Amino acid sequence: WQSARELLRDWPSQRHLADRVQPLRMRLSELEQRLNNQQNAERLLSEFCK
Amino acid sequence: WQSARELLRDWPSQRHLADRVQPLRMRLSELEQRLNNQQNAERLLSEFCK
Amino acid sequence: LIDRVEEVREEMDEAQEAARFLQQHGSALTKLEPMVAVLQSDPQQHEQL
């Protein structure tokens, strides 16, 4: 019974958070491009400053 | 009884999504700063275009 | 032209309203959740039952 109540408590959270996947995917892509630009700028800075 | 069932259904979702306000808060701060930069870029683009 | 700031703002409105409701009725919901089943049984309806 306790496990069942815990499971049915999880189910609300489970669906609500699983709905969040796709918006987070684009956020991850954007953040990846941000990191890529960060490395590009850092590299270019290093080569010039040498 | 039915109203209580619906209330206990929504309430965990309310608790689940309440914590996201602060992560959302910084999210919109960053997003609106980005939008300010985008508006500035668009304005400056148009400014030079002529 | 993401213009998602409006969407994020709506999400904030909903989530802050949820937090406000949690503050408003958190104790009541916690006291209700362990003995919810009683609502299905109304005293006179116990006799009719």
From TrEMBL, chains A, B:
<comment type="function">
    <text>Plays a central role in chromosome condensation, segregation and cell cycle progression. Functions as a homodimer, which is essential for chromosome partition. Involved in negative DNA supercoiling in vivo, and by this means organize and compact chromosomes. May achieve or facilitate chromosome segregation by condensation DNA from both sides of a centrally located replisome during cell division.</text>
</comment>
<comment type="subunit">
    <text>Homodimerization via its hinge domain. Binds to DNA via its C-terminal region. Interacts, and probably forms a ternary complex, with MukE and MukF via its C-terminal region. The complex formation is stimulated by calcium or magnesium. Interacts with tubulin-related protein FtsZ.</text>
</comment>
<protein>
    <recommendedName>
        <fullName>Chromosome partition protein MukB</fullName>
    </recommendedName>
</protein>
<comment type="similarity">
    <text>Belongs to the SMC family. MukB subfamily.</text>
</comment>
